[PDB]
Each structure stands twice: as C-alpha cells, then as structure tokens.
Amino acid sequence: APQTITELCSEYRNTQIYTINDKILSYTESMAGKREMVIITFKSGETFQVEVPGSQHIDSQKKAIERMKDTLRITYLTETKIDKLCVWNNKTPNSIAAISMKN
Amino acid sequence: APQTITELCSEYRNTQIYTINDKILSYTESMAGKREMVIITFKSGETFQVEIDSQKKAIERMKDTLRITYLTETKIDKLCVWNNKTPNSIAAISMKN
Amino acid sequence: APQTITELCSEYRNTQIYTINDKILSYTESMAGKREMVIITFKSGETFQVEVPGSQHIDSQKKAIERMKDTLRITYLTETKIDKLCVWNNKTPNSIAAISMKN
Amino acid sequence: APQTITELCSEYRNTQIYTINDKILSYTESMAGKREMVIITFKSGETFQVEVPGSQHIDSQKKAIERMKDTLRITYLTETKIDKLCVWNNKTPNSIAAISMKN
Amino acid sequence: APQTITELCSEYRNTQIYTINDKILSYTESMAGKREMVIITFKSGETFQVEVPHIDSQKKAIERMKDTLRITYLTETKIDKLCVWNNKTPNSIAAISMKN
Ligand SMILES: CC(=O)N[C@H]1[C@H](OC[C@H]2O[C@@H](O[C@H]3[C@H](O)[C@@H](O)[C@H](O)O[C@@H]3CO)[C@H](O)[C@@H](O[C@@H]3O[C@H](CO)[C@@H](O[C@@H]4O[C@H](CO)[C@H](O)[C@H](O)[C@H]4O)[C@H](O)[C@H]3NC(C)=O)[C@H]2O)O[C@H](CO)[C@@H](O[C@@H]2O[C@H](CO)[C@H](O)[C@H](O)[C@H]2O)[C@@H]1O
Ligand code: NA
Ligand code: NA
Ligand code: NA
Ligand code: NA
Ligand code: NA
Ligand code: NA
Ligand code: NA
Ligand code: NA
Ligand code: NA
Ligand code: NA
Ligand code: NA
Ligand code: NA
Ligand code: NA
Ligand code: NA
C-alpha cells in the first residue's frame, strides 16, 4: 500500500495534491435533499467538498465518506492544522479523497 | 455543487438565511414524542429545531453537529432554515470565527 | 412545536421538570442484563436513569435512547451544566425524557 | 431499579466491585485474530478487559459492548478518574460489566 | 486471555512489537476507492497503516482502530507500543497500547 498521501494520490487519474498548511476557516454542513454534503474553506482562498454519496462510490467508500465528514467537523472545531489534501480535481468544488494533518 | 451556504439555500423553496454570528445559548434534546427533537436558542431570542437512508444519516449528523457546537461554545455564522415549520427547521449550518 | 423544555414536558403524562442548574457529579454505565442502564447523580442527591425499556423494539426509539446516553457521557466529561431534566416520574430512579443545557 | 453501581453489582452472583479512585494507567486495543479486545490497567496492578464473548450474538448486547469500549477510550484520553468497576469474575482478566466515574 | 500487548502480539505469525513512546506527528485518512486506509507517522520516521477492510466483527474492529488513532492524534496522546503485521507495506497495526 502507499506510505504517504502524495504516493496514494499518484495512484488515481483525476487527483491532485494541495499543500494547505492551515486550519479550516469555515465549515458548512447541509442535510437538504440531494445536497447532503460538507464544504470547507481556508483563509488562503481554497474551497473543498465531501461529495453527496452516489454511483461514483463503491460500498467500502460509504462508511469512509461518513468518516471523512466526522474528521472535517472535529478538525474544524479543534483548529487542527491540515498539511495536505488529495482531491478529485474534476469536481466543483474539488472533492476530498484524502486528508493529512500535521503541526 | 454550491460553494457557500447562501448559494445552497437559494436552490430550495421555503428556505431563508438567518445571520447569527453567535454561539448557541441553549441546547434541548427530547425523546418524549414520536420523533426525537433537538431545539437550539440564541441570546437574540431566535429558536430553531432539527427535522431515504441518506436523509436519515444527514439528520443524525446535524443533531450531532449542534450538540458539539453547543458544548465547544463555537460561533455559528449562518443558518439556512425551512420557514414553513415552527420553530424553523435547520437545512444547513455554517461556522466561522 | 414546543420552544422550551418546560413547554415540551407539559405535553406528556407522568412527566415532571427537575431544575438542576449543575454539572453531573457521577456517571455510571452498565451492560449487566438487558436494561443497559446509564445512571447520573448530582451533588443535590438526585439520581436519574436512561434505560432501554423491555417493551421498546422500534428502531428510531432505540437510536434516540443511544443519542441520549451519548449526550449524558459527553456532558459529564466536559463538566457541562444541566439546566433542566424532563423525567418520567413512575420509574425509580426517574427516567430522562428530555434534557436542556444553558450557561 | 438500582440507584448505584454497588446496588446494581449486588444483583449478580458472578460480579464483584473493585473500588479504583484513579485514572486509567494504560489502554490497550487489539484486533489481532478473531475477537477485538480492550484491556485497561491501573497503577495498583489491577487489569480488566472488554470483549464480545464468542457465544454472544444479540445486537442490543453488541451495541452495549461497543459503547463500553468507547467509554474506556475517552475516559483514558481525558485522564478521567474511575470511582468503581463492577466486573465478571468468571474469567481473567476480569470483564467489565459496569463503570462509575466521579471526581 | 492475554493481559499485555506483548502477550497478544506473540499469538500470531508475522507480528512484531514496535516501542514508540511518542505522540503521532501526522494522521492521514483516505476515502479513495480500494484505499480506504489510515496512515500515521512519527517524527522518529516510522510510518504505519490501518489496512483496507474479513468477517463483520473484523470490519468493526478496523473502524474502531481508525477512530482511536484520530482521537489519539488530536489529543497529542503518547503511544507506548504498536503490535504490527510486519509482512505488509507499510507495517499494518494489529494492536496499540498507550501509557504516560
Ligand atoms: C474513458 C477512458 O479513457 N477509460 C479507460 C479506462 O480508464 C479507467 C476507468 O475504467 C473504467 O472501466 C472501463 C473498463 O476498463 C472498460 O473495459 C470498459 O469497456 O469501459 C469501462 C468504462 O470506462 C472504470 O469504470 C473506471 O472507474 C471509475 O473511475 C472514475 C474515475 O474516472 C471514478 O470516479 C471518481 O469517483 C470519485 C469518488 O469515488 C470522485 O467522485 C471523482 O470525482 C470521480 O471521477 C469511479 O469511482 C470509478 N468507478 C469504479 C466502479 O471503480 C476507471 O477505472 O482504462 C481502460 C484500461 O486502461 C481503458 O481501456 C483501454 O482503452 C483503449 C482505448 O482508449 C484501448 O481500447 C485499450 O485496448 C483498452 O484497455 C479505458 O479506455
Ligand atoms: Na474559494
Ligand atoms: Na483559537
Ligand atoms: Na475556536
Ligand atoms: Na462551556
Ligand atoms: Na466559556
Ligand atoms: Na447487556
Ligand atoms: Na476541570
Ligand atoms: Na455481585
Ligand atoms: Na497527563
Ligand atoms: Na474533569
Ligand atoms: Na521513539
Ligand atoms: Na494540538
Ligand atoms: Na502541540
Ligand atoms: Na493528556
């Protein structure tokens, strides 16, 4: 298996690493029908989502989507710094595939 | 997908934005009725509640979010609410600062 | 719908308000037998429970009981003040129907 | 129903109270081989476990075991003092039936 | 039953104890398809994974271990030892102990 977020990101076609080195500025959570999603923003200007679950997700990803939303909420509330994001760069906004937290 | 709570709120009928800019004053949780109800109030006097499988998971998540937001004294920026319920029902929450 | 715990509690038979205005003194969690009790006590001497009733089989009611047990545990660990409890007064100790926290 | 962990523990022949009055010294969590177990130790030298028994198949009993594992982890990480444990003395390490926290 | 992480680790082939005595430097979580995994690193240079999910009880234990590593990281809690499957890349966590 990959040993870093950068190695993991390199295994997929539509993915890109963003170096963030910052805490989350804003956390938005929606339970509105067809938009059950989380949006995060940084003071540096980047906005990212965790996508609404759909056919782009295999069964093993359903629990992982719920875990990632849990992780973003507690990361926001604790003002924990995000090091890197691996994102699907074909979505609007960019969709989080993996997160690393450091410092 | 929308990139802000204001853009998301604009996609639905019977919704409006409340600008809160404050921490939750009170958190109430009840299992007395047919549906579990969570009610939050602000010092302004404004009161809000929480109303397929993906919709059930999102309702449980929103209740979890309001509880931990209350306990951590975290400031709420905006709420997107359904204004056809009394008290108004939360569709989305944003937190900043 | 009700806007306060006092209004909500007035809608139910065999319920009363206890005004607490205090943090939980002790938290007890048991998986002995089938009631799976959580017991909280206050410095006042008052004791309350959250239990799974023998009669209770409906999934949404079980999820609400699990949520209330989660709320009492994190309220205890964070030393958060409880304002009021709405309790079923026909059980010993009284069983919690609703909780409010303020201040 | 019982109002204290000592009263609850007295209802079962194969249980006994250990009075701890201390935080957990060590927390061990294992998913090696067939049964997940959690082991806690105290400075006194006393050691206790939470596991799902091989015989145990009922969903409500599994949910209570998962809750107790969650409670021991957050109690350890928050350095929260344990008052008493009610334990099954049927096997070693003794298995936790109930936990109380105070002070 | 075993009373220590060393005793638990000894029951299985392909396991090793690592003495860590340190807080986690970085926590990585992925929801990418076929790589739903956690990676943790230490400033001392060690990297470990929690593997992609086994019967249902093993899947629940993997989800619990990922939960434990996240809150251990956020609380800056010291890890004493790890029991790892040493045949996996990176080494895969079978058990964790925390003290001090
Ligand atoms: C369009 C294209 O160029 N396709 C390539 C192919 O690329 C990889 C993809 O293969 C699909 O399967 C192919 C299958 O291999 C073919 O044999 C069959 O005929 O067509 C199928 C359909 O294309 C997989 O279905 C793809 O999986 C999906 O991949 C997308 C990413 O693109 C994922 O979506 C992402 O999801 C995440 C969340 O999980 C985010 O939301 C993100 O935003 C979103 O983008 C899906 O999750 C994923 N789904 C599943 C179920 O896994 C993908 O793996 O590669 C093959 C082999 O290299 C090429 O085949 C070659 O084609 C050339 C002609 O170009 C020539 O004929 C060769 O002989 C032949 O091998 C395809 O052309
Ligand atoms: Na932006
Ligand atoms: Na701050
Ligand atoms: Na803050
Ligand atoms: Na407070
Ligand atoms: Na405060
Ligand atoms: Na039980
Ligand atoms: Na304190
Ligand atoms: Na006993
Ligand atoms: Na300490
Ligand atoms: Na304390
Ligand atoms: Na070390
Ligand atoms: Na920190
Ligand atoms: Na620090
Ligand atoms: Na600590």
Numbering used by the authors:
A (entry chain H), C (entry chain F), D (entry chain E): 1 to 103
B (entry chain G): 1 to 51, 58 to 103
E (entry chain D): 1 to 53, 57 to 103
Q: Could you share sentences copied from the article?
A:
The heat-labile enterotoxin (LT), a homologue of the cholera toxin (CT), is produced by enterotoxigenic Escherichia coli (ETEC). There are two natural variants of LT, one isolated from human-infecting ETEC (hLT) and one from porcine-infecting ETEC (pLT).
The structure was obtained after co-crystallization and refined to a resolution of 1.45 Å (R/Rfree = 17.5/20.1). The crystal contained two B-pentamers in the asymmetric unit, giving us access to 10 crystallographically distinct B-subunits. The ligand LNnH is present in two of the 10 primary binding sites, on opposite ends of the decamer, and characterized by high-quality electron density. Ligand binding stabilized the 50s loop (residues 51 to 60), which is disordered in all other subunits. The β6-branch is folded back on the reducing end of the sugar, with the β6-glycosidic bond interacting with Arg13. The terminal galactose of the β6-branch is exposed, explaining why substitution can occur at the 2-, 3-, or 4-position. Both ligand binding sites are in close proximity to neighboring molecules in the crystal, with similar contacts in both cases, therefore we cannot exclude that the β6-branch may adopt a different conformation (or be less ordered) in solution.
